Amino acid sequence: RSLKKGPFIDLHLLKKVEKAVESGDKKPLRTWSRRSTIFPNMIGLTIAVHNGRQHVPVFVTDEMVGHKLGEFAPTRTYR
Amino acid sequence: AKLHDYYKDEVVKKLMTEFNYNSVMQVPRVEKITLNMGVGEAIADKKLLDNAAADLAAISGQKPLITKARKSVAGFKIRQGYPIGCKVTLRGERMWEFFERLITIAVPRIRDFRGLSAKSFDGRGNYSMGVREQIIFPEIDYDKVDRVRGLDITITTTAKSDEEGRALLAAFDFPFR
Amino acid sequence: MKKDIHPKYEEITASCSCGNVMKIRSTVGHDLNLDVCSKCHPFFTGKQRDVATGGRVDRFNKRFNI
Amino acid sequence: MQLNITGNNVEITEALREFVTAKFAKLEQYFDRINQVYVVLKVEKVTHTSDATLHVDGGELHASAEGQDMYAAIDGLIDKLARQLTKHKDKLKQH
Amino acid sequence: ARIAGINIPDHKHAVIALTSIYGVGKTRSKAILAAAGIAEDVKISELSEGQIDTLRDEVAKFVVEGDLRREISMSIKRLMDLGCYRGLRHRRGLPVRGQRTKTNARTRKGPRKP
RNA sequence: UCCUCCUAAAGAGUAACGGAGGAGCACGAAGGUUGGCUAAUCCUGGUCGGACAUCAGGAGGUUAGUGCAAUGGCAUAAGCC
RNA sequence: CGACCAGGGCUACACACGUGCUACAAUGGCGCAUACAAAGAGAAGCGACCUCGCGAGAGCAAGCGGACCUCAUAAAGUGCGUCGUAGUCCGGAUUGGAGUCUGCAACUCGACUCCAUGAAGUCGGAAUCGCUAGUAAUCGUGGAUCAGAAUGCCACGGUGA
What we know:
The structure is cut from a larger assembly and holds chains A, B, C, D and E.
Chain A: H1 11-22, E1 29-31, E2 46-50, E3 55-59
Parallel strand pairs in A: 1-2
Antiparallel strand pairs in A: 2-3
Chain B: H1 2-19, E1 30-38, H2 48-59, E2 65-68, E3 83-90, H3 94-106, E4 127-131, E5 151-157, H4 162-171
Antiparallel strand pairs in B: 1-3, 1-5, 2-3, 4-5
Chain C: E1 10-15, E2 22-26, E3 32-33, H1 57-60
Chain B binds 2 RNA strands through residues 32, 34-40, 43, 67-71, 73, 75-78, 82, 84-87, 89, 119-133, 149-156, 162.
PDB class: ribosome
Keywords: 100S, cryo-EM, E-site tRNA, hibernation, HPF, ribosome, RMF, S1
Entry title: Structure of a hibernating 100S ribosome reveals an inactive conformation of the ribosomal protein S1 - 70S Hibernating E. coli Ribosome
């Protein structure tokens, strides 16, 4: 619930998706940009969001679109 | 008697033309409807059963029979022959007027009413449901009552299997999914 | 039927909001004035709104427009 | 009486907390109704010192004991606290 | 005294009396009476049935009891099915919005068992 | 001291510091008659309600039940109103 | 063990303690109308008026390095109306949806607005604190730090034992 106009992505995630979608479904994309949204042309990819010491992969599903990449990668581990 | 007559000259045509019956008495007619209200809190309060015996006397149109405990189980602190429930069996015309009252004004006043369950059959064609509120009936005036309890309704038909009960109640436009 | 044990049971007229004046036999007071009945109760059409509800891409496409 | 251990440069191990707690409970039972107790453990390169503050109905009372191994300091502090408690107890009996 | 499924208070004024419906408060409850031509300080006994039926379809516009409860259950169960951070807090009973958890957190927690 | 079963050897009876269990009452209805009815235990469906309380249906056919031990009996019921 | 960058953490949570804010209501809640302050801040800043928006706010845009312009409507109070002692028209926590603003960027982790949701709480055991007069107790306002982010701190007045 922020950012009135346009979603947010970096150029190193937007150009990295638009590079690696037309180049076939490939290797999981290491990404450090947790703060970026999930566009509908990212559905079907295994992207590995960095949580601080890992790059945890999450398969992008259709419901995950309005959220951000860091939302599906927890940082602190409890028990 | 209204949807008794509707049974007399629509549902017989629907069921004979769907189920190609040889005899007319192969049709499933409904035999009775039994309204149970099993209390359980009678061992905590003996005169609380009288409040339950007044509800079915107003939901149904006749004085209900209190039902004793058959077995003496210690798991619910009862003994042989302690009154723990109340049934009322209505037949004849009282079940057709009660059926019209039910599916006409009393089922829709169940709040948050989705389509009614259709899995509820005994495998012989006898429907059984349970309603959680007394407030769904206009006789329960909601202002003089004390606790919200429920009851359960058993529609006992002469169906040979569950599918004939489905087609019978579906011929009465009983609500389902 | 037995006498002098059963409640009163009178044919009354129950009318609803959408206009279904119908006289059935019950044990209520003067007469009944309903709102909903077998008619004008959404168990026949107004039931399929909970299915055509979800999705997130369709929500997302009010923000791109390019 | 709840007791509240803290340590400046002294890593409070679980065996250390068990012993201190037992000693404090024993003292509390013996002398007076006690509401709360704060324990502070300090190490200053040589001196294993301990502070304690007891909140009792009359009020605060405090003691401090330096030792050699922490345990000794704790024992000294507890004996000092007991002595202080005897004084406070019949100080408010005084019939 | 029967709209949206329940609506049974009486001797109360109307805009306060409608707020026993799960889905309406004091703003939408004023929107119902201002949109249905009823003054706000009348009582439910003082309404005639020819007004109350015009309030039933009026409150049938905004989402009420059952649809709102299964809708909110669809929202929370949806988030818990995704397994995001928020739904991950919903699966465990801790504050979702990012409140303090070191000290208070106690409405979402409950009572204190130890 | 009394009751029931076995020992007890297919009539009865039959011993042991042989093997197992009970009684020293209860009921004016739990007796008499007349009228009526039929269980246990599982499965299915059913609001709280579960593994089991109450309702309906099916299987089943006395595997129950008898005021109290065990044996014999009981449907024509000796079983339940 | 120095230096640079990205992401995280400093915000974790079975629990324990301290300091505060809001309550538990009728000396009150809500709605309308209306009276009275002092102190202060402002140039990549304070931002009138006018339009749009329920609203946070947006667009245009004067003025002011200021006893002038702006922040900036003081609130408690007062008059009227209602609520009639209930978990209530108290309380406003939590959670869902929709937004706004700031900043590359509000997921971890900002503030605010709107709709909905409506928890504990019916004055607090043992123990404990402040306060002698414009004080206590309440009511609002401003500043610093600051892109944004006070229920804290530092100030100022109102009512006033």
